[PDB]
Scaffold this active site. Structure first.
Site, PDB file in Angstrom:
ATOM      1  N   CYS F  60       1.167  -1.356  -0.714  1.00 47.28           N
ATOM      2  CA  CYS F  60       0.073   0.079  -0.142  1.00 47.28           C
ATOM      3  C   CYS F  60       1.246   1.508  -0.077  1.00 47.28           C
ATOM      4  O   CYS F  60       0.322   2.476  -0.545  1.00 47.28           O
ATOM      5  CB  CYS F  60      -0.875  -0.154   0.953  1.00 47.28           C
ATOM      6  SG  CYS F  60      -0.261   0.178   2.786  1.00 47.28           S
ATOM      7  N   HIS F  96      -2.539  12.373  14.697  1.00 44.86           N
ATOM      8  CA  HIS F  96      -3.278  11.636  13.938  1.00 44.86           C
ATOM      9  C   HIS F  96      -2.142  10.669  13.417  1.00 44.86           C
ATOM     10  O   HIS F  96      -1.685  10.984  12.739  1.00 44.86           O
ATOM     11  CB  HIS F  96      -3.816  12.758  12.798  1.00 44.86           C
ATOM     12  CG  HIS F  96      -4.668  11.765  11.733  1.00 44.86           C
ATOM     13  ND1 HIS F  96      -5.051  10.947  11.358  1.00 44.86           N
ATOM     14  CD2 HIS F  96      -3.501  12.103  10.102  1.00 44.86           C
ATOM     15  CE1 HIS F  96      -5.210  10.410   9.998  1.00 44.86           C
ATOM     16  NE2 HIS F  96      -4.519  10.935   9.307  1.00 44.86           N
ATOM     17  N   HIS F  99      -5.201   4.980  10.047  1.00 41.75           N
ATOM     18  CA  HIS F  99      -6.007   4.287  10.285  1.00 41.75           C
ATOM     19  C   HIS F  99      -5.781   2.599   9.904  1.00 41.75           C
ATOM     20  O   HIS F  99      -4.430   1.791   9.678  1.00 41.75           O
ATOM     21  CB  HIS F  99      -7.137   4.528   9.251  1.00 41.75           C
ATOM     22  CG  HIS F  99      -7.515   6.094   8.956  1.00 41.75           C
ATOM     23  ND1 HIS F  99      -7.073   6.712   8.451  1.00 41.75           N
ATOM     24  CD2 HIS F  99      -8.247   6.609   9.140  1.00 41.75           C
ATOM     25  CE1 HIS F  99      -7.282   7.658   7.811  1.00 41.75           C
ATOM     26  NE2 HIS F  99      -8.392   7.724   8.792  1.00 41.75           N
ATOM     27  N   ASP F 103      -7.686  -6.059   7.664  1.00 40.18           N
ATOM     28  CA  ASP F 103      -7.272  -6.822   6.042  1.00 40.18           C
ATOM     29  C   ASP F 103      -6.243  -7.232   6.308  1.00 40.18           C
ATOM     30  O   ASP F 103      -5.460  -7.645   5.591  1.00 40.18           O
ATOM     31  CB  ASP F 103      -7.588  -6.608   4.997  1.00 40.18           C
ATOM     32  CG  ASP F 103      -6.302  -5.388   4.607  1.00 40.18           C
ATOM     33  OD1 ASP F 103      -6.030  -4.286   6.141  1.00 40.18           O
ATOM     34  OD2 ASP F 103      -6.331  -4.502   3.238  1.00 40.18           O
ATOM     35  N   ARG F 111      -4.317  -4.339  10.096  1.00 41.27           N
ATOM     36  CA  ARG F 111      -3.730  -3.265   9.430  1.00 41.27           C
ATOM     37  C   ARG F 111      -3.888  -1.823   9.936  1.00 41.27           C
ATOM     38  O   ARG F 111      -4.348  -1.468   9.665  1.00 41.27           O
ATOM     39  CB  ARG F 111      -3.694  -3.799   7.603  1.00 41.27           C
ATOM     40  CG  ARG F 111      -2.194  -2.798   7.481  1.00 41.27           C
ATOM     41  CD  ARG F 111      -2.761  -3.686   5.665  1.00 41.27           C
ATOM     42  NE  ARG F 111      -4.019  -2.486   5.015  1.00 41.27           N
ATOM     43  CZ  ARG F 111      -4.220  -1.222   5.324  1.00 41.27           C
ATOM     44  NH1 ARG F 111      -3.268  -0.441   5.950  1.00 41.27           N
ATOM     45  NH2 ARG F 111      -5.266  -0.459   4.319  1.00 41.27           N
ATOM     46  N   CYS F 113      -2.154   1.576   8.991  1.00 40.48           N
ATOM     47  CA  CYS F 113      -1.823   1.892   8.397  1.00 40.48           C
ATOM     48  C   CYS F 113      -1.095   3.295   8.623  1.00 40.48           C
ATOM     49  O   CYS F 113      -2.276   4.408   8.748  1.00 40.48           O
ATOM     50  CB  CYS F 113      -3.188   1.889   7.257  1.00 40.48           C
ATOM     51  SG  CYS F 113      -1.809   2.946   5.756  1.00 40.48           S
TER      52      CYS F 113
END
Lengths: 141, 139, 141, 142, 142, 139
Positions: F60, F96, F99, F103, F111, F113
């Protein structure tokens, strides 16, 4: 008085100072104008006055800008017995910055090879001569 | 430096003001609210014209001053557009600057109102660098 | 208004937009209406609504057209705290275009002084108010 | 050229430029940008940007419009012009189909031609800008 | 596409736009102009200006970049992309040759493709303008 | 240590990701493919958020972990941009992170990310001298 030239000098970079002020010399081939061939003028990096034109410049293999002749009483030559040798140094009259040396193995008629440091020059393209203030020489082209 | 070429390299408003004797809009300038310390040179001649020392917080829309620099700015009788005012311009670069009115902080009681588009500002810490060393004493 | 405003705004030249839509100010003694002194009606350059009269327009030395007072309730005064200041802005109601500002240094009997930009106005002579559809205001003469 | 790209450029042209290139008009003489222009460079098609004439083939004329002895490559085209009741040879750019002007056989040899073009259809590009703007392929002409 | 023209358009691109299209980079997800854009129209090459995608084939994706099920008239080309130690398929513009993005076989269409294009490489052109913009040629699509 | 001043010295991206809940470009960031033994910490609070032991390969383009370390990480519903996601932010600095998707490579299938933009990697050979000795035991 004593703060236009003394100031310009202070704003020079290592090499430019080393050369022009300490009479040192830049590396061969690792300078900016040795192979430069754009039409224009080469002015004193300090006083900004015209020193050499693109027209008298030629291609040597020494690794530094090379001209056959200088400009109107703006470049002076003087004996240089330094370093156990006997040469002819070239300096600018107005800002008295070391430029380089003259040799008698040039291609021109008079056979002179003015070997100057890129570090003591500010090149000015022809299309910018009038703006910068060198309209007076714009005819030399 | 060549007055002719430099003028020829000025912005439309810088030309309009300095050469055509125009007036830039209010509040839409770089020096109307300017309050930094240093000299304000002639955009053309590079000669200093005003100091941050004399500049005062006026609310007319242009950088106003109570005093000019030792005659680098001259006063001229202006009777244009039907009025009788006092025009101010540079003696050397002969650039239009603005007008002098009798309504400033005093004791002069003068409000030299000048166009930003006629002045380049040189920071107080960059004067010796730009060659304006003989002026630092004023700070 | 609605879409007329849009195409009407697209009409205005650079300065009129800068002024009416962007609240900018046209330069002094360098606008079409500060001199004038012509008997007519100064209309809204966007809505076509009458904002000021040639009768209430007095001579000033500021360099922008000035009127002792506006006509109808088409001109609105808003508290303007722009540029770290306290003033009184003026804008048309129907068009919502920045007109300029008002003050209290103008000739009485009210003492107000409306300083409007020429850019935000569109003159209309008396000889043309009837034909131009301003019959209703023609009485003001 | 592609419909939209051409249409885009055309939309830029000011009145005179549009008037001559699209409406086949002519610009007043002695009152255009390149008649007396003599800076070394390329005269590019103002719509397609394709090079049309070089400064090297321009010559001083007393007609009032930039005059060239010849065009560059096959970008300039000659075309019979029986308009206005006479018989002259019009010149247009192939790519942009822009009306340039006319050719006359009173040019200063060797071919005796005189390409009289309106500045309005040209855009000068200085030699010292050629490479920078992607005209390297022509830099050789100087 | 002519070199000189090509260059003018590139000079016009902004930071990110240049980065992506020229340096093969990617714009931040969800923070670009056309990811959530849904207007009847054409998405053309921001350099050559040729049409690349239609608002029709554009579809909602939780990926954060304009997602289309397919390009138009072979103006978009696929090419193996084995960089960053992975195995993907790059999507490039034919005429302009600017990086567009990538394709994935996780598409909702009848052929399951997912063309993930940076907004930066695109310039939207609404239908009601297609005919004045020089795209008269594609109005039929809508 | 000071929050406002620690962030006032942040990078354009760092501030964006960290403060504006923005997100960096995929494959074009410091740790998306970085796999050196150690721990990733909050560029702001300097607190541990992940260990390279939990980091794994994700095509990703953003560093991806199967789980965070203790309470330095919090989960939060982020129904923004017209979708329902699960945002991840730091407990202390409250920055922040990114997310969490369901999956991942398991066993939890999560996961995480994260943006390299909100991390500072610290190699195991500097964990002690840096003050994260009490974490070193995780290798």
């Amino acid at each position: 008085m004593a703060y236009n030239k003394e100031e310009k000098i202070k704003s020079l970079n290592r090499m430019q100072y080393e050369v022009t002020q300490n009479n040192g010399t830049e590396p061969p081939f690792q300078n900016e104008y040795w192979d430069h061939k754009e039409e224009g003028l080469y002015v004193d990096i300090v006083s900004g006055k015209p020193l050499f034109t693109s027209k008298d410049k030629f291609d040597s293999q020494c690794g530094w800008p090379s001209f056959t002749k200088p400009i109107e009483e703006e470049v002076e030559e003087k004996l240089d017995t330094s370093h156990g040798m006997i040469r002819t140094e070239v300096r600018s009259r107005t800002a008295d910055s070391h430029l380089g040396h003259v040799f008698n193995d040039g291609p021109g008629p008079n056979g002179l090879r003015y070997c100057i440091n890129s570090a003591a020059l500010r090149f000015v393209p022809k299309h910018k001569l009038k703006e910068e203030g060198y309209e007076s020489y714009l005819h030399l082209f």
